[PDB]
């Protein structure tokens, strides 16, 4: 039960996103805060998604580090199957 | 487009957008307008001039469009005035036939009344000893009930929601003024106790197994005092809760939302019990029956379903509207369901056979409030045009028009006696109307000459501080309750 | 009359989008075909987002209404990105993109971390009040607004009793009574049509309350003036001709009671009076009537030879609290006179009078004002002995005050 | 414009400076 | 702006007097998202027909093949009236007098023992 | 101000979380439209495990979701859940605190000392007292 062990360790762990903010967007969708550790695992999963996109974008920036531009998010999300849109109207 | 009546601007704007064929092939309101027939009630004195201008070959093309797309329902009588035609038109496929408004409607109350339905017509639930104990303390409240009339104007107690930065979209109060529910845009239902008696959940199953039944206290024994708040928040909708309805036994909160589900919350365990998934679309309203078994929910999919809290599937589908079923109200005998809608029609539906027995047209905007008279004889409807139209139900005829409000009339209720109709709208006013002088007179022309008497029927107008009156409730001692989120705007 | 039209998006914006994508050489009929399709979908959604506005009982289309109107038309509410698979986010609104037309389009990544987060507001609560009492709307703050016959007073006896209770509470016998009465003055909506009797009670009180210098009676009346001013409902500039000479008298008057000890409060009596005086010159302002009139009286109070030092200290405070430019243009050519007055109090042995206390308070206040007047219009170079060109009053201590102000600016 | 309501408010028409009590006695 | 001033006229032609300032910004974000998925599919359909110029029949194809999947509608009136009369023919069932809390079968309700992990 | 703050406090914390993960990656100074893009994908991701893990538990007749309802929710979003114990034990990670919350110290509003006319018998005692 590796993940059951991890969730049991998640008590005493503070995630990068607060549980007052992760729990707010969970309450908005009907998910109510029965257990803090479950909120913390959801927060960590969201963090991993954003972090993986960011790291792929940084490999693209290093290939072309420093500033993150929309032309770095565009090929980074293209392997994810997500076509990001430029603003172009402001 | 500019010679069209001013009340038709919204439909005219939707039409100005529609220029292609495929734009109209996915509208489903103008698709049902093109296949239906406009009813167009005209007199025989004016139809003779019309048919003497259309039966000739000079205009055989516009006569061909008339006899293809328009019904004409002829009555023998005087031609109506312009301010009487303005009172009863306004809908799409509007001003319905008199043959629809001639069915026999059992608009009387249950227990002799010849207009009352039998008790075994609709299979209504039994009256339990705890439900018979409720009516014993209900008639103690009726002892202190004041006769309101045009002289003893009622006191209004506004229950404002102060912070409410999640937008309040639904209010309901129990029949005794004990609970107030709030449906909010952050996908929550919040029950407030207004009496000095905190909201308690019943004990868990381990605690109930050690106590005994058959005791006199029983209910008192079961309450948990560890869980006792003045506020209980209910989570589980994935969208803004639009309907809120209490059951008459003060359990069983109902809520409907944007996610297409109707939810039955217990008020003894304060959890969700059932999720009724019949709509895929936003359910704009729900209401329990006044006997508490059936409930009706109207949604964006242009039907209203009849449920029974025992089946995952509905029992009756009321599927005759051409736009969203905004409101759904039960009759006081619960044999009839009134469904106001966004195509400017109000329709009564028999619970047996699912048939539409009345069609009430004459509103200029989408109907956002319905209420029934406590007699069961009358029906008040409000819409975005600020008009409160009082309809007869036996005759299927509008009996009055109240035109004091400016913006959308979002809440109506009659008094407990029937003496006063209270109206609350988005102009932050609670207007009181004389609901006895409005029904002093009780055809074949299918219409009555409405009196233009709104000024004499206004007993008072009370302005809220920047607060739209979302709910109106009448205490059993005839005290007006109103609830609205304070929006500084 | 209705001249309703059909407005579509411009086609010269649709060719810019097409050629910035790789689709070049598009015809005008091809480009007009794009801008009537998408202008219908904007019209189809904004008509469908108006259903959620009405159902939520709002008159303002919020940003979330289009998120539900899009989800209703089976289109994902996501605006910034589009996921072909649709499995990571399935019809889940991300709340849009906080973007502007006048934005910078590039920020530093530690600027967003170091800014303080906004305060989460209060949760929803249920308060009850009364719209109508047997037909009549009460004037509570939860509500918006031949013999000739024997006349009646224009106040009710509930209103007259209210006036008597509020005035007998505002003379400060008990502090909790005062504080409620002050909040009651600060937010009663129906306190108009009683306001002549309050203004007359204030004005008359200060004038027969400076006959014997009763400081509390005055501190309570000044708090009553401050509670009268911040009430938003009542119309005050009909009564300000009685209000202003009362506050000038609190600031520019001699103290008939013990000179020292409560002079600490006396400075606050002049502190509360100068606060309400510059608040009255902030409001009620028309051309050359109110602010310039009190400025002229303050300046001829200052340039008057051989003043009472209580009057001197009060007028100094009054001219001091007038804002940014007023001390920039007025306190400048007068430092030598202030220094000479301080030197005279110092030389003459007389210590049992109030002259020495008045001098110390005036010098401290003038030195603090001069400090930022300097911190505001010059660099902090040569803060050791350059102030000796200005008679050496505050000097290095003034420089230290300027340094403390600079530290506060750095903290900001 | 000289008939504007403010012109007639007694703050703009009264020498209220004379009221300020200086060294009263 | 140019395209943002036309967006305030599409709303005013629909009678929307009051709106948030972020309403115009994200209807332009949707309008940009909608035209860069019509024209993206238009050159996919042009390469299918093997023509170097994306002409008007390609945009006619890419509109009606995106409107066949994206923008749906409620069910039609001839479909709602058929499922109504199929449902409204069934008579109302009688009620058992003392069944208890009247609920659906337990696989259709939300009343389960509703477990949670042991904290250790 | 406060209604904007209700939404903004929870969006600004999401933006700070995004900025912190970007810094951990290696990015210093990002484009502005690229931050409001990524914090919109972050809010849409928390709102999607909210709607789908509630749907998976309520399909199994429950009301609050366990661990087995999220490890099937994250599978249906393509997450590869096993890599999450290694991500949680980073040495580079930051912590953003919850935003400040306005809270009444004792009572939301102690109103004001007002007492006056008695209630008529059609108004019970639990309704507010008649005022001035």
């Amino acid at each position: 039960t590796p993940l059951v062990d991890f969730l049991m360790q998640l008590e005493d762990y503070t995630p990068t996103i607060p549980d007052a903010v992760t729990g707010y967007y969970l309450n908005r969708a009907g998910f109510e805060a029965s257990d803090p550790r479950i909120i913390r695992l959801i927060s960590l999963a969201a963090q991993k998604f954003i972090s993986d996109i960011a790291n792929d974008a940084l490999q693209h920036c290093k290939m072309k580090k420093y500033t993150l531009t929309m032309e770095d998010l565009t090929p980074a999300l293209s392997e994810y199957g997500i076509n990001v849109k430029k603003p172009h109207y402001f | 487009h500019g010679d069209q009546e001013c009340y038709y601007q919204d439909d005219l704007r939707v039409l100005s957008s529609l220029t292609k064929k495929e734009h109209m092939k996915g509208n489903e309101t103008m698709l049902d307008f093109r296949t239906s027939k406009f009813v167009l009630r005209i007199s025989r004195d004016s139809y003779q001039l019309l048919k003497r201008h259309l039966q000739e070959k000079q205009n055989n093309q516009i006569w061909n469009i008339v006899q293809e797309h328009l019904y004409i329902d002829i009555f023998d009588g005087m031609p109506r005035s312009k301010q009487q035609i303005d009172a009863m038109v306004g809908s799409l496929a509007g001003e319905a036939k008199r043959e629809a408004n001639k069915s026999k409607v059992f608009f009387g109350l249950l227990k002799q009344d010849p207009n009352a339905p039998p008790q075994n017509r609709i299979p209504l639930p039994e009256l339990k000893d705890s439900d018979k104990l409720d009516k014993i303390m209900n008639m103690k409240e009726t002892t202190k009930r004041v006769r309101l009339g045009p002289d003893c104007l009622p006191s209004i107690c506004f229950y404002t929601f102060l912070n409410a930065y999640q937008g309040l979209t639904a209010v309901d109060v129990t029949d005794d003024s004990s609970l107030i529910a709030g449906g909010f845009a952050d996908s929550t239902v919040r029950v407030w106790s207004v009496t000095p008696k905190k909201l308690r959940s019943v004990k868990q199953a381990s605690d109930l197994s050690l106590i005994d039944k058959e005791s006199d206290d029983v209910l008192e024994r079961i309450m948990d005092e560890k869980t006792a708040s003045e506020l209980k928040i209910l989570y589980g909708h994935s969208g803004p809760v639009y309907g809120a309805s209490f059951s008459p036994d003060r359990n069983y909160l109902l809520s409907s939302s944007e996610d297409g589900t109707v939810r039955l919350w217990s008020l003894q365990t304060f959890t969700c019990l059932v999720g009724y998934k019949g709509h895929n679309y936003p359910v704009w309203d729900t209401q329990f029956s006044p006997y508490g078994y059936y409930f009706v929910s109207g949604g964006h999919d242009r039907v209203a379903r009849l449920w029974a809290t025992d089946h995952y599937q509905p029992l009756r589908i009321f599927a005759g509207h051409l736009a969203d079923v905004n409101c759904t109200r039960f009759h006081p005998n619960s044999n009839y369901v009134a469904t106001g809608s966004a195509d400017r029609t109000v329709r009564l539906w028999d619970v047996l056979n699912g048939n539409c027995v009345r069609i009430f047209t004459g509103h200029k905007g989408p109907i956002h409030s319905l209420t029934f008279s406590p007699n069961g004889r009358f029906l008040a409807t409000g819409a975005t045009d600020g008009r409160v139209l009082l309809w007869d139900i036996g005759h299927g005829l509008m009996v009055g028009e109240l035109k004091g409000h400016t913006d959308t009339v979002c809440s109506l209720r009659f008094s407990r006696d029937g003496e006063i109709l209270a109206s609350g709208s988005m102009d932050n006013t609670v207007r009181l109307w004389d609901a006895i002088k409005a029904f002093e007179d009780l055809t074949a022309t299918g219409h009555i000459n409405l009196p233009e008497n709104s000024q004499e029927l206004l007993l008072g107008t009370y302005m809220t501080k920047s607060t739209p009156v979302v709910h109106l409730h009448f205490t059993r001692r005839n005290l007006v309750l109103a609830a609205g989120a304070y929006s500084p705007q | 009359k209705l001249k309703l039209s059909n407005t579509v998006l411009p086609s010269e914006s649709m060719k810019v989008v097409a050629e910035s994508m790789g689709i070049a050489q598009i015809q005008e009929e091809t480009c007009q075909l794009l801008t009537d399709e998408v202008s219908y979908r904007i019209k189809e959604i904004a008509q469908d987002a108006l259903k959620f506005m009405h159902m939520g009982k709002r008159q303002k289309l919020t940003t979330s209404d289009i998120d539900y109107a899009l989800k209703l038309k089976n289109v994902e509410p996501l605006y910034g990105f589009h996921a072909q698979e649709f499995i990571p986010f399935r019809f889940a609104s991300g709340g849009g993109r906080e973007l502007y037309f006048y934005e910078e389009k590039e920020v530093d990544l530690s600027d967003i971390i170091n800014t303080p987060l906004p305060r989460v507001p209060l949760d929803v609560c249920l308060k009850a009040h009364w719209l109508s009492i047997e037909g009549c709307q009460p004037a509570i703050p939860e509500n918006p607004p031949r013999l000739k016959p024997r006349s009646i007073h224009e106040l009710s006896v509930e209103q007259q009793l209210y006036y008597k209770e509020i005035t007998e509470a505002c003379v400060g016998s008990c502090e909790a009574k005062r504080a409620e009465a002050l909040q009651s003055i600060a937010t009663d909506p129906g306190l108009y049509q009683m306001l002549p009797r309050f203004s007359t009670f204030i004005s008359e009180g200060v004038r027969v309350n400076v006959v014997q210098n009763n400081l509390a009676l005055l501190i309570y009346l000044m708090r009553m003036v401050k509670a009268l001013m911040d009430n938003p409902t009542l119309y005050l500039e009909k009564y300000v001709h009685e209000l202003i000479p009362a506050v000038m008298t609190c600031i520019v008057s001699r103290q008939l009671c013990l000179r020292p000890d409560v002079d600490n409060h006396w400075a606050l009596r002049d502190f509360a009076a100068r606060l309400v005086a510059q608040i009255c010159k902030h409001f009620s302002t028309t051309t050359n009537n109110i602010q310039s009139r009190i400025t002229k009286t303050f300046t001829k109070s200052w340039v008057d030879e051989k003043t009472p030092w209580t009057t001197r200290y009060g007028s100094i405070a009054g001219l001091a609290e007038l804002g940014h430019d007023v001390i920039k243009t007025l306190i400048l050519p007068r430092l030598q006179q202030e220094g000479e007055r301080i030197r005279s109090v110092l030389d003459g042995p007389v210590l049992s009078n109030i002259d020495r206390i008045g001098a110390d308070h005036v010098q401290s206040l003038l030195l603090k004002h001069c400090a930022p007047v300097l911190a505001k219009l010059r660099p902090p170079p040569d803060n050791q002995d350059a102030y000796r060109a200005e008679f050496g009053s505050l000097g290095p201590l003034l420089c230290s005050q300027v340094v403390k102000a600079r530290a506060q600016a750095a903290l900001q | 414009d000289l008939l504007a309501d403010e012109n007639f408010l007694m703050v703009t028409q009264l020498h209220w400076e004379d009221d300020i009590i200086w060294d009263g006695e | 702006p140019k395209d943002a001033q036309m967006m305030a006229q599409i709303l005013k032609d629909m009678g929307i007097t009051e709106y948030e300032p972020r309403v115009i910004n994200q209807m332009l974000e949707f309008a940009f998202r909608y035209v860069t998925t019509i024209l993206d599919d238009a050159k996919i359909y042009s390469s299918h027909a093997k023509k170097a110029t994306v002409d008007a029949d390609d945009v006619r194809l890419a509109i009606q093949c995106r409107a066949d999947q994206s923008f749906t509608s409620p069910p039609p009136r001839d479909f709602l009236l058929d499922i109504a009369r199929q449902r409204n023919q069934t008579p109302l069932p009688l009620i058992k007098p003392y069944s208890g809390p009247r609920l659906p079968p337990d696989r259709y309700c939300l009343t389960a023992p509703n477990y949670r992990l042991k904290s250790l | 101000n406060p209604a904007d703050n209700y939404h903004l406090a929870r969006r600004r914390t999401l933006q700070v979380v995004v900025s912190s993960l970007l810094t951990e990656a290696g990015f210093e100074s990002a484009e502005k439209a690229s931050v409001e893009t990524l914090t919109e994908m972050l809010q849409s991701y928390i709102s999607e495990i909210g709607r789908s893990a509630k749907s998976y538990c309520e399909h199994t007749a429950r009301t609050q979701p366990t661990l087995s309802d999220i490890v099937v929710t994250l599978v249906e979003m393509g997450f590869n859940v096993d890599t999450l114990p290694a991500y949680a034990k980073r040495s580079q990670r930051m912590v953003i605190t919850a935003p400040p919350v306005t809270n009444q110290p004792v009572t939301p509003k102690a109103l004001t000392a007002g007492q006056n006319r008695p209630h008529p018998p059609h108004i019970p005692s639990h309704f507010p007292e008649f005022p001035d």
Side-chain angles (χ1 to χ4, degrees), chain C residues 320-359:
Chain C
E321 199 92 37
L322 297 182
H324 202 63
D325 251 338
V326 182
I327 57 173
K328 164 64 171 306
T329 65
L330 205 32
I331 321 290
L332 263 292
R334 288 292 303 278
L335 278 53
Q336 24 73 33
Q337 245 293 18
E338 310 151 0
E340 173 286 327
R341 298 291 181 170
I342 302 306
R343 297 319 177 276
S344 311
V345 318
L346 162 53
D347 64 49
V350 69
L351 164 60
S352 179
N353 57 6
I354 190 193
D355 185 0
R356 292 191 174 267
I357 304 76

Side-chain angles (χ1 to χ4, degrees), chain C residues 286-314:
Chain C
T286 320
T287 96
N288 288 112
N289 45 351
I290 301 195
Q291 168 175 5
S292 60
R293 248 210 222 94
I294 66 168
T295 301
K296 165 201 176 187
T297 56
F298 281 161
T299 58
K300 89 157 81 80
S301 314
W302 200 4
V303 305
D304 170 33
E305 291 295 326
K306 183 235 288 179
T307 340
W309 273 79
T310 73
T311 306
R312 181 179 303 250
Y313 173 59

Side-chain angles (χ1 to χ4, degrees), chain B residues 439-479:
Chain B
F439 307 123
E440 289 292 329
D441 39 357
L442 280 79
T443 62
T445 174
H447 69 241
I448 55 99
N449 297 100
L450 236 68
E452 317 142 279
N453 57 0
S454 306
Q455 307 292 14
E456 86 187 9
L457 293 187
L458 196 63
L459 301 182
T461 172
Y462 307 107
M463 286 74 33
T464 332
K465 198 188 199 175
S466 296
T467 308
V469 185
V470 182
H471 203 245
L472 273 174
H473 187 254
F474 265 93
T475 322
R476 284 206 293 276
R477 314 182 198 186
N478 268 343
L479 182 90

Side-chain angles (χ1 to χ4, degrees), chain B residues 223-445:
Chain B
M223 281 326 195
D224 202 357
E225 205 55 50
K226 300 292 184 182
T227 58
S229 297
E230 304 271 349
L231 158 71
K232 300 299 198 93
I233 314 180
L234 306 156
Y235 301 96
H237 283 286
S238 64
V241 179
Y242 287 119
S245 169
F246 280 108
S247 179
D249 43 25
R250 288 182 57 236
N251 320 319
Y252 287 161
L253 199 147
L254 260 184
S255 64
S256 53
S257 44
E258 197 260 331
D259 53 344
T261 67
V262 194
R263 277 186 189 257
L264 180 76
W265 315 89
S266 195
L267 299 185
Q268 299 158 327
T269 82
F270 278 108
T271 57
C272 200
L273 303 168
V274 194
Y276 302 94
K277 307 200 298 171
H279 315 263
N280 285 111
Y281 298 94
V283 195
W284 301 123
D285 204 7
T286 180
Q287 190 192 3
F288 256 118
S289 168
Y291 303 102
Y293 183 66
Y294 307 106
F295 67 94
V296 57
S297 67
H300 183 261
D301 57 325
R302 311 182 303 163
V303 310
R305 282 152 199 257
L306 180 73
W307 307 86
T309 74
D310 275 338
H311 322 269
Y312 54 98
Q313 281 158 349
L315 319 163
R316 296 289 177 264
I317 297 181
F318 306 127
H321 280 298
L322 302 193
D324 311 352
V325 180
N326 285 358
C327 305
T328 45
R329 299 295 302 200
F330 265 104
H331 203 92
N333 48 45
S334 85
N335 289 44
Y336 291 94
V337 184
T339 67
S341 169
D343 63 336
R344 284 97 64 193
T345 65
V346 186
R347 289 179 196 228
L348 267 158
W349 306 83
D350 199 304
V351 170
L352 281 182
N353 318 291
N355 284 320
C356 189
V357 297
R358 290 290 185 276
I359 295 181
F360 302 122
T361 72
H363 273 297
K364 313 299 197 271
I367 290 96
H368 275 296
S369 61
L370 321 161
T371 194
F372 276 102
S373 194
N375 315 327
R377 296 188 225 148
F378 307 109
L379 170 82
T381 73
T384 78
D385 44 354
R387 283 159 79 239
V388 187
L389 304 195
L390 312 166
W391 312 86
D392 210 307
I393 295 165
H395 304 246
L397 295 189
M398 60 177 315
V399 279
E401 161 176 343
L402 320 168
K403 40 174 188 163
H405 276 301
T406 312
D407 207 79
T408 298
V409 184
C410 41
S411 56
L412 313 157
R413 206 151 301 248
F414 284 96
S415 296
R416 292 303 187 128
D417 294 308
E419 294 288 326
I420 284 174
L421 174 81
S423 289
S425 87
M426 312 289 299
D427 58 1
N428 318 316
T429 45
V430 186
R431 275 161 205 265
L432 304 180
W433 310 93
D434 202 359
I436 288 299
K437 212 191 173 183
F439 307 123
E440 289 292 329
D441 39 357
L442 280 79
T443 62
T445 174

